[PDB]
Short mmCIF file of C-alpha atoms in Angstrom, two decimals:
data_model
loop_
_atom_site.label_atom_id
_atom_site.label_comp_id
_atom_site.label_asym_id
_atom_site.label_seq_id
_atom_site.Cartn_x
_atom_site.Cartn_y
_atom_site.Cartn_z
CA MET A 1 282.53 231.70 86.99
CA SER A 2 286.01 232.34 88.54
CA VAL A 3 286.41 235.56 90.57
CA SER A 4 288.95 236.77 88.03
CA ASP A 5 286.47 236.14 85.19
CA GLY A 6 283.82 238.33 86.86
CA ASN A 7 282.91 241.32 84.75
CA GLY A 8 280.06 243.74 84.07
CA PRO A 9 277.92 245.98 86.31
CA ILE A 10 277.09 245.26 89.90
CA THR A 11 274.72 247.00 92.27
CA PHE A 12 275.43 247.62 95.94
CA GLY A 13 272.69 247.92 98.55
CA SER A 14 273.93 250.51 101.04
CA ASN A 15 272.64 251.59 104.44
CA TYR A 16 275.12 254.48 104.46
CA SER A 17 272.36 257.12 104.32
CA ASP A 18 274.01 259.76 106.51
CA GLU A 19 275.96 262.36 104.54
CA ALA A 20 279.51 261.60 105.71
CA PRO A 21 279.55 257.80 105.29
CA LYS A 22 277.41 258.12 102.12
CA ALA A 23 280.11 260.31 100.63
CA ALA A 24 282.96 258.08 101.76
CA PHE A 25 281.31 254.93 100.42
CA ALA A 26 280.55 256.58 97.03
CA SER A 27 284.20 257.55 96.79
CA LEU A 28 285.43 254.04 97.67
CA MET A 29 283.15 252.42 95.07
CA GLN A 30 284.37 254.88 92.44
CA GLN A 31 287.92 253.80 93.28
CA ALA A 32 286.91 250.13 93.21
CA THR A 33 285.27 250.61 89.81
CA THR A 34 288.44 252.16 88.45
CA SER A 35 290.74 249.56 89.97
CA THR A 36 288.69 246.43 89.24
CA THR A 37 286.97 247.73 86.03
CA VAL A 38 283.69 246.44 87.47
CA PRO A 39 281.27 249.36 87.28
CA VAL A 40 279.72 249.77 90.71
CA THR A 41 276.21 251.25 91.19
CA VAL A 42 275.35 252.24 94.77
CA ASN A 43 271.67 252.03 95.76
CA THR A 44 271.24 253.82 99.07
CA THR A 45 268.38 253.16 101.46
CA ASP A 46 267.47 254.96 104.71
CA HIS A 47 269.66 253.29 107.32
CA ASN A 48 266.91 252.01 109.67
CA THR A 49 264.71 250.87 106.81
CA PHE A 50 267.54 248.91 105.27
CA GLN A 51 268.02 246.96 108.47
CA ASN A 52 264.30 246.63 109.28
CA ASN A 53 263.67 245.31 105.77
CA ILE A 54 266.70 243.08 105.34
CA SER A 55 264.97 239.70 105.49
CA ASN A 56 262.51 240.72 102.73
CA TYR A 57 265.23 242.45 100.73
CA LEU A 58 267.37 239.31 100.72
CA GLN A 59 264.34 237.14 99.80
CA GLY A 60 263.32 239.35 96.83
CA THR A 61 265.59 240.99 94.26
CA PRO A 62 268.56 242.22 96.32
CA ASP A 63 271.63 243.98 94.95
CA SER A 64 274.80 242.12 93.94
CA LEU A 65 276.46 243.11 97.27
CA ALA A 66 275.12 244.78 100.41
CA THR A 67 276.23 246.53 103.55
CA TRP A 68 275.71 244.41 106.68
CA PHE A 69 277.52 243.66 109.98
CA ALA A 70 278.71 240.73 112.01
CA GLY A 71 276.49 238.92 114.58
CA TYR A 72 273.24 237.00 115.00
CA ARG A 73 271.54 238.09 111.82
CA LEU A 74 274.51 237.43 109.55
CA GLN A 75 274.63 233.83 110.82
CA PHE A 76 270.87 233.30 110.45
CA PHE A 77 270.87 234.61 106.89
CA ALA A 78 273.67 232.17 106.01
CA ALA A 79 271.73 229.23 107.49
CA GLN A 80 268.67 230.34 105.49
CA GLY A 81 270.66 230.09 102.27
CA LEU A 82 270.26 233.81 101.56
CA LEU A 83 273.96 234.51 101.20
CA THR A 84 276.56 233.35 98.72
CA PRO A 85 279.69 231.94 100.36
CA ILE A 86 282.94 233.79 99.59
CA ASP A 87 285.68 231.28 100.49
CA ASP A 88 287.25 232.15 97.12
CA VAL A 89 287.44 235.86 98.02
CA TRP A 90 289.05 234.87 101.32
CA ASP A 91 291.65 232.73 99.52
CA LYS A 92 292.89 236.07 98.28
CA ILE A 93 292.37 238.42 101.25
CA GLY A 94 292.74 236.04 104.23
CA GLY A 95 296.41 236.86 104.75
CA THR A 96 295.32 240.38 105.71
CA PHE A 97 293.15 239.51 108.70
CA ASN A 98 293.58 237.75 112.05
CA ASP A 99 291.64 234.74 113.40
CA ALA A 100 289.14 236.96 115.24
CA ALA A 101 288.32 238.84 112.01
CA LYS A 102 287.98 235.53 110.20
CA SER A 103 285.64 234.12 112.87
CA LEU A 104 283.24 237.05 112.79
CA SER A 105 283.16 236.71 108.99
CA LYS A 106 282.27 232.97 108.95
CA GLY A 107 279.16 230.81 109.45
CA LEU A 108 279.11 227.77 111.78
CA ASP A 109 279.40 225.83 108.54
CA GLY A 110 282.96 227.11 108.34
CA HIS A 111 282.31 229.14 105.17
CA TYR A 112 282.99 232.85 104.79
CA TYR A 113 280.07 235.23 104.26
CA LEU A 114 281.25 238.67 105.25
CA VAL A 115 284.11 240.96 104.25
CA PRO A 116 284.64 243.21 107.31
CA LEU A 117 285.76 246.84 106.95
CA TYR A 118 285.99 248.54 110.42
CA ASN A 119 284.97 248.41 114.10
CA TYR A 120 285.50 250.37 117.34
CA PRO A 121 286.10 249.32 120.94
CA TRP A 122 284.10 249.21 124.17
CA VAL A 123 286.83 250.00 126.75
CA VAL A 124 287.57 251.98 129.96
CA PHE A 125 288.50 255.63 129.28
CA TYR A 126 290.57 257.83 131.62
CA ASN A 127 292.60 261.06 131.59
CA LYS A 128 296.37 260.54 131.36
CA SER A 129 297.16 263.71 133.34
CA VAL A 130 295.10 262.39 136.27
CA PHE A 131 296.66 258.92 136.31
CA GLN A 132 300.07 260.59 136.22
CA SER A 133 299.37 263.27 138.81
CA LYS A 134 297.57 261.00 141.28
CA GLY A 135 299.77 257.95 140.90
CA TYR A 136 297.34 255.49 139.31
CA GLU A 137 298.38 252.54 137.16
CA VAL A 138 296.26 250.79 134.55
CA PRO A 139 294.70 247.85 136.39
CA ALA A 140 295.12 244.50 134.55
CA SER A 141 293.21 242.41 137.06
CA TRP A 142 290.02 242.62 139.10
CA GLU A 143 292.00 242.93 142.38
CA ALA A 144 294.00 245.92 141.03
CA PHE A 145 290.86 247.53 139.55
CA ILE A 146 289.00 247.45 142.89
CA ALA A 147 292.04 248.75 144.75
CA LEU A 148 292.32 251.61 142.24
CA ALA A 149 288.62 252.40 142.50
CA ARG A 150 288.99 252.63 146.33
CA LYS A 151 292.03 254.88 145.94
CA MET A 152 290.03 257.11 143.57
CA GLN A 153 287.26 257.42 146.21
CA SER A 154 289.97 258.13 148.82
CA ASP A 155 291.03 260.98 146.52
CA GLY A 156 287.49 262.38 146.15
CA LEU A 157 286.69 261.01 142.69
CA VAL A 158 283.80 258.92 141.49
CA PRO A 159 285.65 255.88 140.12
CA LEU A 160 283.39 255.04 137.17
CA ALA A 161 281.19 257.67 135.54
CA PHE A 162 278.07 255.69 134.82
CA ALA A 163 274.78 256.36 133.01
CA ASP A 164 271.80 254.32 131.86
CA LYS A 165 268.93 256.75 131.20
CA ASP A 166 269.55 255.90 127.55
CA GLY A 167 268.95 252.19 128.22
CA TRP A 168 271.55 250.66 125.92
CA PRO A 169 274.76 251.80 127.70
CA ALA A 170 274.44 249.34 130.58
CA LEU A 171 274.11 246.40 128.19
CA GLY A 172 277.86 246.82 127.61
CA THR A 173 278.61 246.15 131.24
CA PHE A 174 276.50 243.00 131.15
CA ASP A 175 278.42 241.95 128.02
CA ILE A 176 281.90 242.62 129.34
CA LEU A 177 281.23 240.92 132.70
CA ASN A 178 279.84 237.86 130.89
CA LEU A 179 282.84 237.73 128.57
CA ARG A 180 285.30 238.03 131.50
CA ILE A 181 283.54 235.54 133.78
CA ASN A 182 281.96 232.97 131.49
CA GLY A 183 283.74 233.60 128.18
CA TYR A 184 282.83 234.26 124.58
CA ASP A 185 281.19 230.88 123.74
CA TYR A 186 278.94 231.08 126.79
CA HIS A 187 277.97 234.68 126.02
CA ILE A 188 277.00 233.75 122.44
CA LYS A 189 274.98 230.73 123.66
CA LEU A 190 273.00 232.97 125.99
CA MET A 191 272.50 235.57 123.25
CA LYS A 192 271.17 232.85 120.96
CA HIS A 193 269.00 231.46 123.77
CA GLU A 194 270.79 228.11 123.70
CA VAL A 195 271.35 228.77 127.42
CA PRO A 196 268.46 230.25 129.48
CA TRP A 197 268.61 233.58 131.31
CA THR A 198 267.95 231.61 134.50
CA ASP A 199 271.36 229.90 134.10
CA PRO A 200 273.79 230.14 137.08
CA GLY A 201 276.34 231.78 134.77
CA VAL A 202 274.04 234.80 134.51
CA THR A 203 273.65 234.89 138.27
CA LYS A 204 277.45 235.12 138.44
CA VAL A 205 277.44 238.14 136.14
CA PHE A 206 274.97 239.98 138.37
CA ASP A 207 276.75 238.90 141.54
CA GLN A 208 280.02 240.38 140.24
CA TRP A 209 278.15 243.53 139.17
CA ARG A 210 276.94 243.88 142.81
CA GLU A 211 280.56 244.62 143.67
CA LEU A 212 281.28 246.75 140.61
CA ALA A 213 278.19 248.88 141.32
CA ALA A 214 279.77 250.18 144.57
CA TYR A 215 282.24 252.11 142.40
CA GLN A 216 279.76 253.15 139.76
CA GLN A 217 278.25 256.67 139.77
CA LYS A 218 274.96 256.90 141.71
CA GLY A 219 271.75 257.99 139.96
CA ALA A 220 272.71 256.20 136.78
CA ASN A 221 269.22 255.55 135.48
CA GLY A 222 268.60 259.33 135.49
CA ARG A 223 271.81 260.21 133.64
CA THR A 224 272.50 260.54 129.97
CA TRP A 225 275.74 258.92 128.77
CA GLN A 226 276.95 262.37 127.57
CA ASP A 227 276.58 263.70 131.11
CA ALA A 228 278.68 260.76 132.41
CA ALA A 229 281.34 261.48 129.72
CA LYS A 230 281.35 265.11 130.78
CA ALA A 231 282.02 264.02 134.41
CA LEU A 232 285.06 262.16 133.11
CA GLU A 233 286.16 265.11 130.96
CA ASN A 234 285.72 267.58 133.87
CA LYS A 235 287.81 265.23 136.02
CA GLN A 236 284.98 264.52 138.48
CA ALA A 237 285.23 260.79 137.69
CA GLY A 238 288.35 258.67 137.19
CA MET A 239 287.08 256.30 134.47
CA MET A 240 284.22 255.55 132.11
CA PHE A 241 283.40 252.32 130.24
CA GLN A 242 281.69 252.73 126.88
CA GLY A 243 282.26 252.80 123.12
CA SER A 244 285.03 255.04 121.73
CA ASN A 245 282.59 256.69 119.26
CA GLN A 246 280.63 257.90 122.30
CA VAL A 247 283.11 258.85 125.04
CA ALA A 248 285.98 260.02 122.84
CA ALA A 249 283.49 261.63 120.40
CA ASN A 250 282.03 263.66 123.29
CA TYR A 251 285.35 265.24 124.37
CA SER A 252 286.23 268.75 123.21
CA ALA A 253 289.24 269.06 120.90
CA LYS A 254 291.14 270.81 123.69
CA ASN A 255 290.77 267.86 126.09
CA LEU A 256 291.01 265.01 123.61
CA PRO A 257 294.76 264.81 123.82
CA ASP A 258 294.48 263.85 127.53
CA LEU A 259 292.15 260.90 126.77
CA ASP A 260 293.36 257.30 126.86
CA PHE A 261 291.80 253.90 127.58
CA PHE A 262 292.53 250.43 128.90
CA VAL A 263 290.57 247.23 128.29
CA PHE A 264 288.24 246.11 131.03
CA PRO A 265 290.34 244.21 133.58
CA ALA A 266 290.70 240.45 133.63
CA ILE A 267 288.64 238.57 136.19
CA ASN A 268 290.22 235.12 135.83
CA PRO A 269 293.03 233.48 133.93
CA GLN A 270 290.69 231.27 131.88
CA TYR A 271 289.34 234.18 129.83
CA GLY A 272 291.85 236.92 130.71
CA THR A 273 291.10 239.98 128.56
CA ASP A 274 290.57 237.79 125.46
CA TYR A 275 287.20 239.28 124.43
CA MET A 276 285.62 242.64 123.72
CA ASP A 277 282.49 244.09 122.13
CA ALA A 278 283.76 245.79 118.97
CA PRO A 279 280.80 246.31 116.57
CA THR A 280 282.05 245.36 113.13
CA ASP A 281 280.54 246.57 109.83
CA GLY A 282 281.25 244.94 106.46
CA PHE A 283 279.74 243.49 103.31
CA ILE A 284 277.79 240.45 102.18
CA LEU A 285 276.95 238.87 98.81
CA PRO A 286 273.16 238.21 98.60
CA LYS A 287 272.51 234.78 96.96
CA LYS A 288 269.67 236.24 94.84
CA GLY A 289 271.90 239.10 93.82
CA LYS A 290 273.02 239.29 90.19
CA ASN A 291 276.56 238.89 88.80
CA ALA A 292 278.21 237.09 91.70
CA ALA A 293 281.66 236.73 90.10
CA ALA A 294 282.06 240.48 89.46
CA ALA A 295 280.66 241.11 92.91
CA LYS A 296 283.48 238.92 94.35
CA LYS A 297 286.13 240.97 92.50
CA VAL A 298 284.82 244.07 94.20
CA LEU A 299 284.80 242.32 97.61
CA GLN A 300 288.44 241.43 97.09
CA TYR A 301 289.23 245.13 96.56
CA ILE A 302 287.27 246.04 99.71
CA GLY A 303 289.13 243.46 101.83
CA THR A 304 292.43 245.39 101.76
CA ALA A 305 294.29 247.77 104.08
CA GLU A 306 294.18 250.28 101.20
CA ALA A 307 290.36 250.30 101.03
CA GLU A 308 290.10 250.58 104.80
CA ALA A 309 292.43 253.55 104.93
CA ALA A 310 290.57 255.35 102.14
CA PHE A 311 287.12 254.86 103.62
CA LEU A 312 288.25 255.86 107.12
CA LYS A 313 289.97 259.10 106.04
CA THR A 314 287.11 261.19 107.50
CA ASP A 315 286.05 258.77 110.22
CA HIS A 316 287.44 259.70 113.62
CA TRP A 317 286.68 256.58 115.72
CA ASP A 318 286.33 253.47 113.54
CA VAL A 319 289.46 251.46 112.71
CA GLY A 320 290.16 248.91 109.95
CA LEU A 321 290.51 245.20 110.74
CA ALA A 322 293.58 244.77 108.48
CA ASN A 323 296.30 243.16 110.64
CA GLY A 324 298.01 245.94 112.63
CA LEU A 325 297.16 248.71 110.14
CA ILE A 326 297.90 252.24 111.38
CA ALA A 327 296.40 254.64 108.81
CA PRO A 328 298.01 258.09 108.51
CA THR A 329 294.73 259.80 109.49
CA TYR A 330 294.23 257.96 112.82
CA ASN A 331 294.22 259.90 116.05
CA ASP A 332 295.68 258.36 119.24
CA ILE A 333 292.42 256.74 120.35
CA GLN A 334 292.21 254.99 116.99
CA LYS A 335 295.87 253.89 117.20
CA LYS A 336 295.32 252.27 120.58
CA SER A 337 292.06 250.76 119.30
CA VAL A 338 293.96 248.97 116.54
CA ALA A 339 296.47 247.70 119.12
CA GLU A 340 293.93 246.44 121.66
CA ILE A 341 291.21 245.13 119.34
CA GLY A 342 293.87 243.25 117.37
CA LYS A 343 294.96 241.32 120.49
CA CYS A 344 291.45 239.94 121.05
CA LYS A 345 290.88 236.24 120.44
CA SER A 346 287.27 236.88 119.44
CA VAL A 347 285.26 240.09 119.24
CA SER A 348 281.61 240.19 120.11
CA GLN A 349 279.23 242.72 118.48
CA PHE A 350 277.41 244.37 121.43
CA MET A 351 274.24 242.77 122.83
CA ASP A 352 271.95 244.32 120.27
CA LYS A 353 273.74 242.61 117.38
CA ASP A 354 274.64 239.36 119.14
CA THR A 355 271.10 238.57 120.26
CA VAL A 356 267.93 239.59 118.37
CA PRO A 357 266.82 243.25 118.70
CA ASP A 358 263.64 242.33 120.62
CA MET A 359 265.62 240.52 123.32
CA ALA A 360 268.16 243.32 123.65
CA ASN A 361 265.26 245.70 124.09
CA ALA A 362 263.71 243.43 126.70
CA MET A 363 266.94 243.51 128.70
CA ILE A 364 267.06 247.30 128.91
CA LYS A 365 264.41 247.67 131.65
CA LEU A 366 265.47 244.50 133.46
CA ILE A 367 269.07 245.77 133.73
CA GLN A 368 267.72 249.15 134.82
CA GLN A 369 265.77 247.28 137.50
CA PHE A 370 269.02 245.65 138.65
CA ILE A 371 270.92 248.94 138.77
CA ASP A 372 268.25 250.54 141.02
CA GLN A 373 268.09 247.55 143.39
CA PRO A 374 271.13 245.33 143.01
CA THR A 375 270.12 242.57 145.41
CA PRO A 376 269.91 238.79 145.22
CA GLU A 377 266.11 239.07 145.26
CA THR A 378 266.22 241.50 142.27
CA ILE A 379 268.65 239.24 140.39
CA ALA A 380 266.29 236.27 140.75
CA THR A 381 263.40 238.43 139.49
CA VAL A 382 265.44 239.78 136.59
CA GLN A 383 266.57 236.33 135.55
CA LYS A 384 263.06 234.94 135.71
CA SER A 385 261.54 237.80 133.70
CA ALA A 386 264.33 237.76 131.15
CA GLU A 387 263.78 234.04 130.58
CA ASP A 388 259.96 234.41 130.43
CA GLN A 389 260.29 237.03 127.73
CA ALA A 390 262.98 235.02 125.90
CA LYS A 391 260.62 232.05 125.73
CA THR A 392 258.21 234.29 123.82
CA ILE A 393 260.79 236.09 121.66
CA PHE A 394 262.63 232.99 120.49
CA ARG A 395 260.40 230.75 118.51
#
């Protein structure tokens, strides 16, 4: 049945269980119903349960459409035949999105499976008043970054506020170093365990982190990320690398206007600053779902700048993927997020969505082990353990 022939009710499996996004999604689907004349029913499930249960959900009697996100699981579901391809939807909406947005929405088979809605950046935050007062420039390269971090220490500042008591924050540093040194394709190969954790490329990541760590706040494994963000906000540290919906979210309204960011500096010209973790949420069409053609009409409505701006009205950190869209509700962090994310050649999804959850979990303690003892002997141990556990996790 042609997209334009699609009519009648659809259901929508939604993991938007928290009050704010639940409300925003209900409102968007009401608008979609009115615009498309496809009546949309939203079936909400507890957020964790929806993602824990996804493989069974998709194998049983799923809804016509569902909330999901880019990364390892999306691609596996496609290969399993659990998702309906939506090349026809993308014939209509493809002009709205860049090649990076297209890539994260596609299988290896070259077909589209996802319609993305929004994402947010992992970047290096700083206070503008401090850069201005102290005479710091944004560093574009590794050599400039290190020189700036030494100047910050000369001025009595911790260069990078840094925390890993929470376990996941340090995974971002592993990601961004891998992306800068080895590139996106290599990073994804490692996350999929096509390349082993004992690979020399991983050694290179840790070796570079040995130098970075000299400028990273001491005592990191005992520090919450909110306490690191507060060190930035109180001007005790010069910079902090993390997700905007963490660092910027933690700032008081009074200090927010001083907050800015830059992308993690380039390490070599091969990969420049081409890549970033920017966790991207969107929508899929379950193969066993009912009324595919109507479901595609609703996806077409969702894959617009208009839908993005409506949904994000009350969202302070996420930004739409529509090419260059600046929504009237965006604050300055979101504006710069659109600018920087949009320049990326590919965007990765953070380690916990690019590998399988079990492997991301495994890496938490191993990276903590590194941070406590960042030596060549520790790196060998970490690589060996990581690969041992990977050989069990990946089947």
